[PDB]
Amino acid sequence: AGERRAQNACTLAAVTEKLGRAAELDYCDLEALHAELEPLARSADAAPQVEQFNELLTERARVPRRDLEHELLERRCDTELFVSTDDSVHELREKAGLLFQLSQLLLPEPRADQLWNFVCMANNFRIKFIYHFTEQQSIENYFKFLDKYLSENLYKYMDIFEDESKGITRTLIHKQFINHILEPVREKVNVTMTKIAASNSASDVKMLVLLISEIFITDNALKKSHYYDGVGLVSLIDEAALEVWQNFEVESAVSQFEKLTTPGASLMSPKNGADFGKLLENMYRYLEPFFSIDYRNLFSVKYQLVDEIFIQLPLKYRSFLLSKNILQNELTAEQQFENTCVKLHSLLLISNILVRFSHDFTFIEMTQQINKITDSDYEYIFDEVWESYDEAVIVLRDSIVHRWVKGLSSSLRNYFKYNEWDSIATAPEQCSAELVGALAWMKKMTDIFDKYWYPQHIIAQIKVALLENIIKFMLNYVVKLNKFSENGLRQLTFDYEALRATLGLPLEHSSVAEELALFEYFNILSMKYTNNKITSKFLDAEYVSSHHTRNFRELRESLQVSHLTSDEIADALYRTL
Amino acid sequence: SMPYATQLALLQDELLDMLEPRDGEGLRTADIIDKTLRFRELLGCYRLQVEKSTRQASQAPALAQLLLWERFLADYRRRLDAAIVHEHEATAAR
């Protein structure tokens, strides 16, 4: 191993001897030295040789810097007094080409501020900026100045300093001319920034927060207005300043959240759901620029902001609802019902809000940033909220149906007590006098439910579940406990269609199997009143026993009863007698 | 129109056309999101309708169309998000 140190420091000690002859060394020699020293860079044995070679490049670049900067300022190349032509631009491109070639020879790689050609190109702006300006509004004014200059000079300087032969591309000039024009703004801003980051006063901590937020804003506008895919003023933000901004933003969001999750004993209202929704939208409007900025050392906080605000807060909000309120024991039955309706509404509203967030471009991108860094195969970041919300929606939906059905069982008690279905005076013209109370209640109930918005299928789900519970009530508590007149049955059919009518079911569509069965059972029931030839045969108590095991092969075909069971057809026939 | 299965039938075509606008003005992304939300809702309605057609089969084509539509919506969100990315990439390199 020592055979490559006494041999290494030999070429390394011949480099210093050729360096000791600064004059009578042309650019070709500088390339030959780069060829020899390049491998040995970063070794730290050749560090002195590096330091010398770099400070030689710098001295070889000092004169064309003073010339290029003087020519640029004395010809007013960034004003209307200068036009780009083969003559007035010729010498500028020579001085800048040589400066670029010299910068590219720095070992190991040139610093950002050592691209001397771009430093010279930006010098004019540096002088104008420092002259004109000796916080959030200041940073905004700096952007206004920067933007105006960039607008009228960027593509012009690209036309001037284009040099494909020497590596100076148009894409490079676009990136670097903006970056170097930005440097005096970074220095000016970062003075007042480090002046605030050195204080613990609230006024200070907020002024720092607003500063950082303004930086994010201006970086965003720079990327949009001049198509700049380089670093802005985000370089000024250190991890200690981010932690401050991030915590201020999460605290602001939680503070607003907690003023919405304060448990009042009054019936829950939709507003609270809409206000939490607005909170999520406002906080996303505020955090949009930060989210859109592409700096890797930023992802660590972007995920933190996504989780704590757009996942944690919705989950906590779900548990804000569904929560033991001993302060809500004084609620009416119809109040507890409306309270649940409102809960389900609010929950599904926040769900759709997150659905919209999930297709905005900034979310799609930082969702892939998360799926890459955490190696977690998430489709959307909101999958964990949705899947946790889909559970609570069922619990709520079931609660609505149960609480609704419990109430219907209560209001039909009067209608249940009526037993004169075998002695009916005439045909139905209105609804049974004992059902009027229930019909009214059931309309009050559907109207309360209809006050609020739910997805169409969840409406259908709840209302169908109640149509079925209505059928079960009519069949088991009334029909399958009485025998019916001609018009007693017509009256009952009326009553049923009135109760179905109160649900305001999404109708003109098809009918549920349970209701088809209901009307098949009615149809059989109704043969007690038509003395047809093929109906005296069927309405025999002995035909029922003798045919029950065939599943009534005859009757099924004759009467289109295709949704009732054998036992059911039997009970109907038996009920005609 | 009125039937769920023809509402879904048309809405699928519409949702596919939004992805390739002959407009100039790009994607009407808010309208697309609104449509996919309505597609999900209508899907749920068709699902309920099929389910509640037999009490607690010849309802096979409806189940097939339902499955292929649920798969459609699932893939369509990926197609949409891709298009949304592409549309901003294109309007940055111009």
XYZ file of C-alpha atoms in Angstrom:
671
model
C 0.000 0.000 0.000
C 2.946 2.299 0.618
C 4.081 1.824 -2.981
C 1.224 4.140 -4.034
C 2.167 7.069 -1.774
C 5.862 7.644 -2.468
C 4.870 7.218 -6.143
C 1.715 9.294 -5.778
C 3.433 12.222 -4.083
C 5.989 12.200 -6.921
C 3.534 13.267 -9.577
C 2.003 15.310 -6.795
C 5.305 17.125 -6.223
C 5.833 17.674 -9.940
C 2.446 19.366 -10.151
C 3.634 21.929 -7.565
C 6.762 22.581 -9.603
C 4.801 23.235 -12.772
C 2.415 25.392 -10.703
C 5.442 27.378 -9.510
C 5.657 28.628 -13.090
C 2.355 30.497 -13.363
C 3.473 32.465 -16.404
C 4.429 30.701 -19.638
C 1.590 28.253 -18.958
C -1.236 28.329 -21.489
C -4.759 26.943 -21.080
C -3.508 23.671 -22.586
C -1.161 23.310 -19.632
C -4.056 23.946 -17.262
C -5.856 21.028 -18.891
C -2.772 18.806 -18.570
C -2.607 19.686 -14.873
C -6.313 18.987 -14.441
C -5.645 15.593 -16.042
C -2.932 14.788 -13.521
C -4.408 16.308 -10.341
C -8.089 15.234 -10.907
C -7.632 11.601 -9.706
C -5.635 12.678 -6.636
C -8.296 15.200 -5.590
C -10.077 14.673 -2.239
C -7.201 12.341 -1.309
C -6.255 15.047 1.284
C -2.596 14.317 0.534
C -2.951 16.396 -2.620
C -5.121 19.017 -0.915
C -2.346 21.670 -1.004
C -1.856 21.030 -4.697
C -5.608 21.450 -5.206
C -5.758 24.704 -3.233
C -2.938 26.101 -5.375
C -4.406 24.952 -8.698
C -7.806 26.454 -7.821
C -6.333 29.768 -6.709
C -4.352 29.808 -9.956
C -7.536 29.324 -11.957
C -9.051 32.179 -9.926
C -6.115 34.471 -10.691
C -6.299 33.419 -14.363
C -9.973 34.445 -14.258
C -9.652 37.734 -12.350
C -8.852 39.869 -15.426
C -11.619 38.612 -17.765
C -14.032 39.102 -14.873
C -13.197 42.781 -14.508
C -13.403 43.143 -18.280
C -16.700 41.295 -18.780
C -18.296 43.133 -15.836
C -17.059 46.511 -17.061
C -18.188 45.858 -20.632
C -21.618 44.652 -19.459
C -22.085 47.738 -17.273
C -20.548 50.316 -19.659
C -22.562 49.112 -22.669
C -25.767 48.900 -20.584
C -26.479 45.439 -21.948
C -29.581 44.962 -19.756
C -31.377 48.132 -20.926
C -33.010 49.323 -24.139
C -29.784 51.107 -25.142
C -28.176 47.787 -26.124
C -29.107 45.351 -28.880
C -27.521 41.943 -29.443
C -25.513 41.882 -32.674
C -22.532 40.022 -34.122
C -20.369 43.077 -33.270
C -21.560 44.373 -29.882
C -21.713 40.884 -28.358
C -18.541 39.284 -29.842
C -16.087 40.260 -27.070
C -18.578 39.592 -24.262
C -18.921 35.981 -25.383
C -15.141 35.538 -25.466
C -14.617 36.803 -21.923
C -17.554 34.736 -20.627
C -16.503 31.621 -22.538
C -13.034 31.724 -21.043
C -14.490 32.314 -17.570
C -16.708 29.237 -17.969
C -13.842 27.070 -19.228
C -11.759 28.149 -16.235
C -14.547 27.442 -13.741
C -15.027 23.917 -15.104
C -11.372 23.087 -14.281
C -11.832 23.635 -10.530
C -11.160 20.583 -8.365
C -13.024 18.590 -7.472
C -16.085 20.445 -8.791
C -16.612 24.219 -8.934
C -18.697 25.780 -6.189
C -21.994 27.426 -7.077
C -20.487 30.913 -6.703
C -17.405 30.051 -8.798
C -19.259 29.980 -12.151
C -17.570 33.287 -12.908
C -19.320 33.916 -16.241
C -22.724 33.786 -14.548
C -21.503 35.900 -11.620
C -20.507 38.584 -14.113
C -23.811 38.280 -15.969
C -25.625 38.912 -12.651
C -23.370 41.765 -11.428
C -25.529 44.465 -13.083
C -28.611 43.172 -11.280
C -26.680 43.009 -8.015
C -25.835 46.704 -8.270
C -29.367 47.773 -9.223
C -30.883 45.672 -6.428
C -28.512 46.806 -3.674
C -29.024 50.433 -4.729
C -32.836 50.298 -4.748
C -33.114 48.583 -1.309
C -30.989 50.396 1.289
C -40.247 40.918 5.766
C -43.229 39.570 3.828
C -43.876 42.825 1.971
C -40.162 43.411 1.445
C -39.723 39.896 0.027
C -42.739 40.562 -2.211
C -41.203 43.814 -3.478
C -37.945 41.935 -4.084
C -39.900 39.485 -6.209
C -41.600 42.299 -8.141
C -38.208 43.888 -8.929
C -36.629 40.508 -9.734
C -39.562 39.480 -11.939
C -39.574 42.692 -13.982
C -35.831 42.496 -14.617
C -36.033 38.780 -15.430
C -38.937 39.368 -17.816
C -37.183 41.939 -19.948
C -33.644 40.453 -19.730
C -33.637 36.623 -19.312
C -34.273 35.513 -22.880
C -32.127 38.386 -24.146
C -29.127 37.233 -22.131
C -29.800 33.699 -23.338
C -29.622 34.992 -26.916
C -26.389 36.827 -26.065
C -24.385 34.181 -24.193
C -25.506 31.040 -26.049
C -22.410 28.979 -26.845
C -23.000 25.321 -27.729
C -19.346 24.873 -28.751
C -18.075 25.644 -25.224
C -20.890 23.964 -23.309
C -22.878 27.094 -22.465
C -26.360 25.821 -23.344
C -29.567 27.796 -23.362
C -31.002 25.613 -20.582
C -27.945 26.320 -18.437
C -28.111 30.067 -18.982
C -31.800 29.985 -18.063
C -31.120 28.151 -14.796
C -27.950 29.941 -13.685
C -28.770 33.518 -14.715
C -31.839 33.317 -12.465
C -29.912 31.573 -9.664
C -27.164 34.193 -9.602
C -29.631 37.062 -9.928
C -31.315 35.497 -6.875
C -28.135 35.481 -4.780
C -28.231 39.158 -3.593
C -31.861 38.590 -2.628
C -30.934 35.537 -0.607
C -28.265 37.546 1.200
C -30.550 40.507 1.914
C -33.432 38.333 3.125
C -31.253 35.959 5.158
C -29.933 38.917 7.144
C -33.339 39.865 8.527
C -34.170 36.163 8.809
C -31.219 35.221 10.978
C -31.993 38.455 12.857
C -35.406 37.034 13.754
C -34.421 33.379 14.226
C -32.199 34.572 17.134
C -35.153 35.555 19.339
C -37.753 33.632 21.354
C -40.400 36.405 21.465
C -43.831 35.479 20.098
C -43.881 38.575 17.865
C -40.566 37.261 16.487
C -41.653 33.619 16.117
C -44.710 34.727 14.144
C -42.668 37.153 12.047
C -40.310 34.272 11.206
C -43.271 32.076 10.301
C -44.706 34.698 7.952
C -41.233 35.240 6.454
C -40.814 31.526 5.650
C -44.360 31.370 4.236
C -43.565 34.338 1.984
C -40.408 32.574 0.801
C -42.500 29.551 -0.193
C -44.931 31.860 -2.025
C -42.250 33.694 -3.986
C -40.415 30.475 -4.887
C -43.730 29.183 -6.249
C -44.421 32.314 -8.279
C -40.867 32.208 -9.637
C -41.377 28.648 -10.865
C -44.648 29.640 -12.544
C -43.907 33.074 -14.072
C -40.449 32.294 -15.520
C -40.353 28.469 -15.721
C -37.478 28.219 -13.237
C -36.626 24.670 -12.144
C -33.758 25.662 -9.845
C -33.422 26.575 -6.197
C -35.150 29.715 -4.936
C -34.897 31.209 -1.453
C -35.788 27.848 0.138
C -32.033 27.333 0.579
C -32.196 29.892 3.399
C -34.598 27.729 5.442
C -32.598 25.641 7.917
C -34.081 22.599 9.642
C -34.432 24.624 12.842
C -36.509 27.269 11.076
C -38.702 24.692 9.383
C -39.470 22.970 12.688
C -40.745 26.358 13.896
C -42.910 26.986 10.816
C -44.255 23.407 10.762
C -45.236 23.480 14.422
C -46.855 26.906 14.086
C -48.989 25.589 11.221
C -50.021 22.368 12.957
C -50.822 24.320 16.132
C -52.978 26.787 14.169
C -54.877 23.903 12.585
C -55.392 21.985 15.828
C -56.437 25.174 17.647
C -59.168 25.760 15.065
C -60.104 22.057 15.153
C -60.512 21.969 18.952
C -62.924 24.919 18.815
C -65.171 22.713 16.646
C -64.915 19.517 18.731
C -66.034 21.318 21.893
C -69.046 19.222 22.965
C -72.198 21.278 23.237
C -75.290 19.560 24.553
C -77.456 20.955 21.757
C -78.475 18.791 18.807
C -75.633 18.394 16.298
C -75.847 20.667 13.259
C -74.440 20.487 9.687
C -72.557 23.776 10.050
C -69.887 22.183 12.293
C -69.222 19.655 9.521
C -69.000 22.381 6.908
C -66.719 24.490 9.103
C -64.310 21.589 9.618
C -64.427 21.103 5.845
C -63.562 24.761 5.323
C -60.747 24.356 7.850
C -59.287 21.542 5.741
C -59.621 23.594 2.555
C -58.115 26.758 4.048
C -55.211 24.786 5.506
C -54.619 23.209 2.112
C -54.711 26.588 0.385
C -52.105 27.835 2.849
C -49.906 24.732 2.527
C -50.183 24.407 -1.290
C -46.971 26.338 -2.172
C -44.878 24.470 0.390
C -46.257 21.148 -0.863
C -45.425 22.003 -4.483
C -41.750 22.894 -3.813
C -39.340 20.087 -4.792
C -36.510 19.978 -2.245
C -35.649 16.538 -0.889
C -34.846 17.714 2.625
C -38.407 19.025 2.733
C -40.255 15.718 2.291
C -39.633 14.911 5.966
C -41.953 17.753 6.976
C -44.366 17.486 4.058
C -45.337 14.018 5.247
C -45.589 15.363 8.768
C -47.974 18.062 7.603
C -50.037 15.637 5.490
C -50.466 13.148 8.343
C -51.127 15.492 11.270
C -53.660 17.633 9.349
C -55.221 15.705 6.454
C -55.296 12.252 8.083
C -55.170 12.661 11.861
C -57.670 15.526 12.070
C -60.295 13.733 9.888
C -59.877 10.567 11.969
C -60.197 12.506 15.226
C -63.237 14.271 13.779
C -64.900 10.931 13.097
C -64.378 10.143 16.789
C -65.664 13.623 17.643
C -68.939 12.187 16.438
C -69.855 8.670 17.628
C -68.939 9.912 21.118
C -70.694 9.402 24.465
C -72.524 12.661 25.194
C -74.173 12.358 28.609
C -75.132 15.984 27.939
C -77.425 14.631 25.187
C -79.687 12.422 27.300
C -82.452 15.055 27.260
C -82.926 14.631 23.505
C -86.250 13.666 21.975
C -86.413 10.486 19.915
C -86.829 12.617 16.797
C -83.923 14.763 17.987
C -81.584 11.806 18.434
C -82.675 10.677 14.959
C -81.887 14.029 13.345
C -78.614 14.217 15.295
C -77.545 10.916 13.735
C -78.635 12.040 10.273
C -76.425 15.135 10.637
C -73.475 13.019 11.799
C -73.664 10.742 8.732
C -74.025 13.800 6.469
C -70.985 15.591 7.932
C -68.832 12.447 7.759
C -69.655 11.816 4.090
C -69.028 15.488 3.296
C -65.511 15.379 4.678
C -65.043 12.142 2.734
C -65.806 13.812 -0.595
C -63.595 16.784 0.346
C -60.673 14.382 0.723
C -61.651 12.736 -2.574
C -61.209 16.086 -4.325
C -57.883 16.718 -2.567
C -56.769 13.293 -3.823
C -56.847 14.379 -7.496
C -55.143 17.772 -7.196
C -51.697 17.515 -8.820
C -49.611 18.422 -5.761
C -51.165 15.572 -3.804
C -50.620 13.005 -6.573
C -46.946 13.942 -6.642
C -46.226 13.970 -2.948
C -48.224 10.726 -2.715
C -45.647 9.147 -4.947
C -42.880 10.781 -2.897
C -44.390 8.999 0.121
C -44.903 5.700 -1.710
C -41.201 5.841 -2.661
C -39.557 6.927 0.604
C -41.727 4.946 3.038
C -41.859 2.062 0.497
C -45.575 1.890 1.361
C -47.883 0.861 -1.496
C -50.593 3.458 -0.947
C -52.952 4.265 -3.804
C -53.977 7.556 -2.199
C -52.753 8.872 1.141
C -56.416 9.078 2.180
C -56.967 5.308 1.900
C -56.449 4.981 5.644
C -59.066 7.655 6.336
C -61.626 6.374 3.814
C -61.359 2.778 4.993
C -61.756 3.974 8.580
C -64.668 6.207 7.567
C -66.469 3.455 5.638
C -66.838 1.594 8.920
C -68.345 4.547 10.772
C -70.741 5.170 7.910
C -72.251 1.691 8.309
C -72.551 2.100 12.081
C -74.340 5.394 11.468
C -76.569 4.098 8.689
C -77.625 1.115 10.774
C -78.288 3.453 13.693
C -80.570 5.574 11.551
C -82.630 2.613 10.350
C -82.870 1.067 13.789
C -83.848 4.337 15.436
C -86.333 5.008 12.667
C -87.890 1.526 12.819
C -88.096 1.600 16.609
C -90.172 4.749 16.227
C -92.447 3.279 13.573
C -93.156 0.236 15.731
C -94.245 2.759 18.359
C -96.585 4.883 16.241
C -98.368 1.889 14.672
C -99.570 0.626 18.081
C -102.990 2.229 17.594
C -103.237 0.905 14.037
C -102.103 -2.452 15.445
C -104.954 -2.551 17.984
C -107.629 -2.338 15.257
C -109.059 -5.806 14.566
C -112.223 -5.230 12.498
C -110.749 -6.255 9.166
C -113.428 -8.855 8.491
C -116.443 -6.466 8.636
C -115.724 -3.615 6.202
C -118.582 -1.227 5.414
C -117.370 -0.047 1.989
C -114.469 0.626 -0.406
C -111.521 2.783 0.695
C -111.675 6.522 0.066
C -109.099 7.718 2.621
C -106.639 6.084 5.015
C -107.582 4.141 8.148
C -108.413 6.590 10.925
C -105.914 4.980 13.314
C -103.071 5.127 10.760
C -103.334 8.914 10.285
C -101.048 9.587 13.240
C -98.378 7.203 12.004
C -98.540 8.440 8.398
C -98.061 12.002 9.696
C -95.134 10.939 11.899
C -93.505 9.006 9.047
C -93.726 12.082 6.828
C -92.173 14.234 9.566
C -89.422 11.617 9.684
C -88.602 11.390 5.998
C -88.655 15.214 5.858
C -86.131 15.395 8.719
C -83.937 12.833 6.974
C -84.286 14.677 3.644
C -83.056 17.956 5.164
C -79.453 16.826 4.575
C -77.294 15.562 1.713
C -76.141 11.964 1.415
C -74.759 9.994 -1.536
C -77.584 8.649 -3.692
C -76.885 4.980 -2.970
C -76.821 5.525 0.791
C -80.223 7.215 0.553
C -81.553 4.252 -1.409
C -80.042 1.845 1.148
C -81.721 3.479 4.159
C -85.087 4.025 2.478
C -85.275 0.500 1.034
C -84.409 -0.931 4.456
C -87.434 0.924 5.767
C -89.711 -0.166 2.943
C -88.839 -3.724 3.932
C -89.498 -3.004 7.617
C -92.887 -1.533 6.624
C -93.708 -4.723 4.736
C -92.699 -6.887 7.707
C -94.849 -4.762 10.040
C -97.928 -4.974 7.813
C -97.506 -8.711 7.198
C -96.685 -10.009 10.679
C -98.540 -7.566 12.933
C -101.682 -7.089 10.800
C -102.161 -9.346 7.756
C -100.963 -12.614 9.283
C -103.195 -11.979 12.315
C -106.558 -11.175 10.662
C -108.933 -12.304 7.935
C -110.128 -9.755 5.443
C -113.232 -8.468 3.711
C -113.382 -7.490 0.065
C -112.892 -3.873 0.945
C -111.035 -4.599 4.176
C -108.276 -5.882 1.959
C -108.642 -2.969 -0.425
C -108.376 -0.645 2.622
C -105.219 -2.392 3.810
C -103.645 -2.140 0.354
C -104.442 1.591 0.380
C -102.839 1.932 3.832
C -99.680 0.158 2.666
C -99.300 2.316 -0.423
C -99.753 5.425 1.747
C -96.925 4.340 4.030
C -94.711 3.493 1.057
C -95.643 6.931 -0.323
C -94.320 8.727 2.748
C -90.774 7.390 2.225
C -90.494 9.311 -1.054
C -88.621 6.310 -2.412
C -86.614 6.849 -5.608
C -89.446 5.578 -7.769
C -90.569 4.981 -11.356
C -87.854 2.290 -11.115
C -88.201 -1.453 -10.414
C -89.655 -2.976 -7.246
C -87.970 -4.908 -4.442
C -88.445 -8.685 -4.309
C -89.996 -8.303 -0.848
C -92.693 -6.008 -2.226
C -93.373 -8.243 -5.210
C -93.899 -11.034 -2.677
C -96.201 -8.757 -0.660
C -98.433 -8.146 -3.673
C -98.374 -11.811 -4.697
C -99.648 -12.679 -1.221
C -102.296 -9.972 -1.624
C -103.205 -11.381 -5.037
C -103.820 -14.835 -3.548
C -105.727 -13.272 -0.615
C -107.940 -11.568 -3.214
C -109.310 -14.806 -4.704
C -111.773 -14.953 -1.788
C -113.922 -12.474 -3.733
C -113.886 -13.678 -7.374
C -115.832 -16.901 -7.976
C -113.741 -18.101 -10.917
C -113.609 -21.738 -12.015
C -109.862 -22.097 -11.352
C -110.253 -20.391 -7.970
C -112.784 -22.644 -6.245
C -110.354 -25.491 -6.944
C -107.445 -23.651 -5.301
C -109.347 -22.228 -2.303
C -109.767 -25.669 -0.717
C -108.187 -26.511 2.632
C -107.539 -30.025 1.328
C -105.973 -28.815 -1.913
C -103.410 -27.032 0.246
C -102.337 -30.193 2.059
C -102.511 -32.348 -1.072
C -100.388 -29.946 -3.156
C -98.043 -28.349 -0.574
C -95.344 -30.947 -1.302
C -95.442 -30.249 -5.053
C -94.557 -26.629 -4.214
C -97.956 -25.990 -5.847
C -96.848 -26.821 -9.386
C -100.375 -26.030 -10.604
C -100.961 -22.773 -8.715
C -97.527 -21.292 -9.472
C -98.074 -21.464 -13.237
C -101.738 -20.439 -12.975
C -101.276 -17.340 -10.802
C -97.697 -16.098 -11.448
C -96.701 -16.507 -7.795
C -92.924 -16.791 -8.188
C -91.587 -14.985 -5.100
C -93.570 -16.725 -2.333
C -92.469 -19.938 -0.656
C -94.545 -23.111 -0.377
C -95.370 -22.352 3.262
C -96.292 -18.790 2.288
C -98.712 -19.738 -0.493
C -100.201 -22.222 1.973
C -100.762 -19.572 4.651
C -102.385 -17.238 2.097
C -104.787 -19.878 0.771
C -105.613 -20.919 4.337
C -106.276 -17.244 5.077
C -108.943 -17.007 2.399
C -111.095 -19.533 4.313
C -81.847 8.314 -18.767
C -84.001 6.813 -15.998
C -82.565 3.267 -15.579
C -79.413 2.979 -13.480
C -77.725 0.659 -15.973
C -78.132 3.109 -18.841
C -77.152 6.059 -16.703
C -73.927 4.211 -15.893
C -73.597 3.167 -19.550
C -73.675 6.778 -20.784
C -71.672 8.208 -17.862
C -68.858 5.780 -18.718
C -68.627 7.155 -22.254
C -68.721 10.728 -20.957
C -65.966 10.017 -18.397
C -63.822 8.481 -21.130
C -64.308 11.448 -23.458
C -63.283 13.953 -20.763
C -59.792 12.397 -20.880
C -59.273 13.532 -24.509
C -60.770 17.022 -24.911
C -60.906 18.370 -28.469
C -61.344 21.746 -26.779
C -58.073 23.610 -26.298
C -58.888 24.317 -22.639
C -57.556 20.983 -21.352
C -59.226 18.712 -18.820
C -62.401 19.795 -17.021
C -61.030 18.078 -13.935
C -63.656 19.383 -11.495
C -66.424 18.056 -13.744
C -64.546 14.751 -14.039
C -64.261 14.343 -10.262
C -67.961 15.207 -9.963
C -68.783 12.562 -12.554
C -66.700 9.830 -10.914
C -68.424 10.620 -7.598
C -71.794 10.280 -9.333
C -70.597 7.074 -11.013
C -69.740 5.599 -7.609
C -73.169 6.603 -6.252
C -75.002 5.155 -9.262
C -72.912 1.981 -9.008
C -74.053 1.588 -5.414
C -77.645 2.063 -6.582
C -77.338 -0.587 -9.314
C -75.695 -2.916 -6.776
C -78.568 -2.419 -4.331
C -81.118 -2.901 -7.125
C -79.587 -6.220 -8.182
C -79.179 -7.410 -4.578
C -82.775 -6.574 -3.607
C -84.224 -8.430 -6.622
C -84.133 -11.835 -4.880
C -85.362 -12.339 -1.327
C -83.362 -13.728 1.589
C -79.537 -17.139 -11.317
C -81.034 -15.138 -14.184
C -79.477 -11.961 -12.717
C -76.028 -12.913 -14.102
C -75.668 -10.258 -16.838
C -76.450 -7.533 -14.310
C -73.783 -8.915 -11.973
C -71.265 -9.090 -14.814
C -71.932 -5.517 -15.915
C -71.669 -4.485 -12.245
C -68.290 -6.160 -11.781
C -66.829 -4.747 -14.982
C -68.111 -1.283 -14.020
C -66.516 -1.425 -10.569
C -63.255 -2.446 -12.237
C -63.736 0.394 -14.719
C -64.086 3.035 -12.000
C -61.037 1.649 -10.196
C -58.869 1.829 -13.314
C -60.390 5.143 -14.435
C -59.053 6.927 -11.376
C -55.537 5.785 -12.323
C -56.080 6.921 -15.918
C -57.361 10.296 -14.701
C -54.514 10.934 -12.251
C -52.035 10.031 -15.002
C -53.696 12.411 -17.476
C -53.679 15.138 -14.796
C -49.929 14.734 -14.321
C -49.229 14.628 -18.073
C -51.274 17.813 -18.639
C -49.125 19.838 -16.225
C -45.880 18.307 -17.478
C -46.829 19.317 -21.031
C -47.722 22.870 -19.942
C -44.309 23.391 -18.312
C -42.141 22.323 -21.267
C -43.851 24.824 -23.582
